[PDB]
Design an enzyme around this catalytic site. Structure first.
Site, PDB file in Angstrom:
ATOM      1  N   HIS A   1       0.922  -1.258   0.017  1.00 33.15           N
ATOM      2  CA  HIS A   1      -0.151   0.175  -0.061  1.00 33.15           C
ATOM      3  C   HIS A   1       0.850   1.267  -0.005  1.00 33.15           C
ATOM      4  O   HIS A   1       0.298   2.238   0.000  1.00 33.15           O
ATOM      5  CB  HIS A   1      -0.949  -0.152   1.160  1.00 33.15           C
ATOM      6  CG  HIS A   1      -1.885   1.153   1.279  1.00 33.15           C
ATOM      7  ND1 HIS A   1      -1.740   2.143   2.235  1.00 33.15           N
ATOM      8  CD2 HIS A   1      -3.294   1.154   0.888  1.00 33.15           C
ATOM      9  CE1 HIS A   1      -2.782   2.893   1.965  1.00 33.15           C
ATOM     10  NE2 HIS A   1      -3.834   2.207   1.151  1.00 33.15           N
TER      11      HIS A   1
ATOM     12  N   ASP B   1      -6.166  15.090  -0.317  1.00 34.63           N
ATOM     13  CA  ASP B   1      -4.906  14.104  -0.106  1.00 34.63           C
ATOM     14  C   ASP B   1      -3.679  15.143   0.001  1.00 34.63           C
ATOM     15  O   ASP B   1      -3.516  16.218  -0.150  1.00 34.63           O
ATOM     16  CB  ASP B   1      -4.754  13.238  -1.170  1.00 34.63           C
ATOM     17  CG  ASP B   1      -4.395  11.753  -0.870  1.00 34.63           C
ATOM     18  OD1 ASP B   1      -3.764  11.781   0.286  1.00 34.63           O
ATOM     19  OD2 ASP B   1      -4.810  10.822  -1.336  1.00 34.63           O
TER      20      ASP B   1
ATOM     21  N   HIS C   1      -8.153  11.630   2.125  1.00 37.77           N
ATOM     22  CA  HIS C   1      -7.448  10.255   2.309  1.00 37.77           C
ATOM     23  C   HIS C   1      -6.207  10.546   2.838  1.00 37.77           C
ATOM     24  O   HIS C   1      -5.339   9.918   2.703  1.00 37.77           O
ATOM     25  CB  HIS C   1      -7.330   9.643   0.760  1.00 37.77           C
ATOM     26  CG  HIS C   1      -8.365   9.197   0.108  1.00 37.77           C
ATOM     27  ND1 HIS C   1      -8.278   8.470  -1.237  1.00 37.77           N
ATOM     28  CD2 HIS C   1      -9.426   8.886   0.475  1.00 37.77           C
ATOM     29  CE1 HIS C   1      -9.432   8.289  -1.696  1.00 37.77           C
ATOM     30  NE2 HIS C   1     -10.284   8.340  -0.669  1.00 37.77           N
TER      31      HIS C   1
ATOM     32  N   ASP D   1       3.269  -0.538   4.178  1.00 36.85           N
ATOM     33  CA  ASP D   1       3.115   1.029   4.340  1.00 36.85           C
ATOM     34  C   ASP D   1       4.737   1.659   4.692  1.00 36.85           C
ATOM     35  O   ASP D   1       5.454   1.253   5.028  1.00 36.85           O
ATOM     36  CB  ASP D   1       1.959   1.726   4.890  1.00 36.85           C
ATOM     37  CG  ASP D   1       0.729   1.395   4.416  1.00 36.85           C
ATOM     38  OD1 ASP D   1       0.357   2.283   3.226  1.00 36.85           O
ATOM     39  OD2 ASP D   1      -0.180   0.989   5.049  1.00 36.85           O
TER      40      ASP D   1
END
Length: 480
Positions: free
Chosen positions: A168, A200, A415, A440
């Site tokens: 991700h 974002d 996000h 991540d």
């Protein structure tokens, strides 16, 4: 005696060395001498927020989106050795593919030969759509003669089906020297071709911390190449007779890195489930990986890092996320240690602001009930917990203009994976605060000047418009 100028990083660093000492250098690393990579016209455009509108329910001002694509193209166009990309599947498309092809052409026209790795994480539900030899052939075609000069690795991966783990992280590293990272996965994913764009944030820097991100990607590609013949874990494709470049970064770029600026940074990521079982060097001694798996923490230092960042706050904390709760069984609902750290801060009088994305895209009731319950465990009663919470919490859903929705009828969505403390130290990356067991990555930056720019350019306007939705707001005595 000397007084540290980096008290927050010092604290996070101390925790990371307790939890994941054997992963220092590869999955997390503290470096000095970085530069937040904003031009001279705009000192502050290291902060790549999208769309970048505020006060306009039509979002006329798309300067942020234009800037992001220009920076991608520019950074790639200045490559002389390596380009290293990770995202969530699908492979780059649309405007992002256009920026990559234009950058690679620009670098090829200057006479450079490059190695390029493009790695995506696939959810088993998504798998068929992601075809690496198809993407390889489409990118080769769009490059034309520039493809003659590109050694390409393209791969999609799933590290665990049972525990829902895959990549991700959203990273772009060039020559191991410049890095972009954050929450932005693709142009369409954030509805940027649209008049209801998602909000974002990414950051751009240069220096040693860019090498940190390359070493993190070396860790994922080493596992990917080890598993490249296991069709259930990895689909891999390469140009020509090229091999699988497990350690592009160690190989083509050194480890001692010259300083480009004066910004200290902790790079920190996680290996999810199925890459490494445990950090064998760790002595940390604290199915649900988020809340009840010691070994999982030792290979996912970012979870501990974010909780330590919260714990390091002396005055105030701002959290901006899609959500704090997960709605994806078998994943737990929330990170218990995280909510406990937020409660402890409020019990000491540290202010906490939480802004989450509109549930349409109460969500808020769930957050405040859990915080209240954790505070009751600390303060001994529900009435004392309400006092601590109501007096120290701001809790709201996100808005970017005085309108309750975009002008076109759709709700606002966000996000961000953003945390900031004491207008001093902040995290920008891909790691959500709700439970997730993915690979991540992100950066924790300690710089009061940059943090004040983050306030002025992002968090301040955010709250100006989101406070209209607040269910708790100690600054106006709201506690519903």
């Amino acid at each position: 005696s000397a007084d540290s100028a980096t008290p927050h990083l010092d604290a996070v660093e101390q925790t990371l060395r307790q939890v994941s000492p054997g992963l220092e250098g590869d999955v997390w690393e503290r470096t000095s001498g970085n530069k937040l990579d904003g031009s001279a016209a705009d000192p502050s455009d290291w902060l790549l927020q999208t769309p970048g509108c505020w006060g306009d329910d039509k979002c006329a001002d798309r300067v942020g989106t234009k800037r992001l694509l220009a920076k991608m193209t520019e950074n790639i166009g200045n490559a002389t050795r390596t380009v290293d990309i990770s995202t969530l599947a699908p492979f780059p498309n649309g405007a992002f593919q256009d920026a990559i092809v234009a950058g690679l052409k620009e670098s090829a026209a200057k006479g450079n030969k490059l190695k390029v790795r493009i790695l995506v994480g696939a959810a088993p539900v998504y798998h068929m759509n992601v075809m690496p030899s198809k993407y390889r052939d489409e990118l080769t075609a769009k490059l034309g003669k520039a493809a003659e000069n590109i050694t390409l690795n393209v791969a999609s991966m799933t590290t665990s089906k049972t525990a829902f783990s895959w990549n991700h992280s959203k990273i772009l590293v060039v020559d191991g020297q410049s890095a972009l990272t954050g929450g932005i996965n693709s142009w369409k994913d954030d509805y940027l071709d649209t008049t209801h764009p998602v909000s974002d944030v990414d950051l751009a820097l240069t220096g040693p911390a860019a090498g940190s991100a390359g070493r993190y990607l070396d860790t994922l590609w080493t596992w990917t190449c080890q598993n490249k013949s296991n069709i259930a874990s990895v689909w891999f494709a390469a140009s020509g007779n090229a091999g699988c470049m497990a350690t592009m970064h160690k190989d083509t770029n050194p480890k001692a890195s010259p300083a480009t600026g004066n910004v200290p940074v902790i790079a920190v990521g996680g290996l999810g489930v199925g890459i490494k079982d445990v950090d064998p060097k760790s002595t940390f001694r604290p199915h649900d990986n988020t809340n009840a798996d010691r070994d999982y923490d030792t290979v996912n230092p970012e979870e501990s890092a974010l909780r330590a960042l919260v714990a390091s706050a002396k005055s105030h904390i701002e959290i901006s996320q899609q959500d704090l709760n997960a709605t994806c069984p078998p994943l737990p609902r929330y990170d218990i240690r995280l909510y406990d750290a937020l409660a402890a801060k409020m019990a000491a009088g540290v202010k906490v602001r939480i802004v989450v994305s509109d549930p349409a895209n109460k969500s808020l009731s769930e957050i405040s009930d859990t915080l209240r319950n954790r505070l009751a465990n600390i303060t001994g009663s529900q009435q004392a917990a309400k006092t601590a919470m109501c007096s120290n919490l701001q809790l709201a859903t996100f808005r970017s203009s005085p309108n309750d929705k975009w002008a076109d009828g759709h709700p606002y969505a966000q996000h961000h994976k953003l945390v900031s403390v004491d207008s001093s130290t902040f995290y920008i990356g891909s790691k959500n605060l709700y439970p997730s067991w993915l690979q991540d990555f992100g950066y924790i930056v300690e710089s009061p000047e940059a943090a004040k720019q983050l306030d002025a350019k992002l968090l301040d306007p955010q709250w100006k418009y989101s406070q209209e939705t607040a269910t708790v707001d100690y600054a106006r005595g709201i506690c519903n």
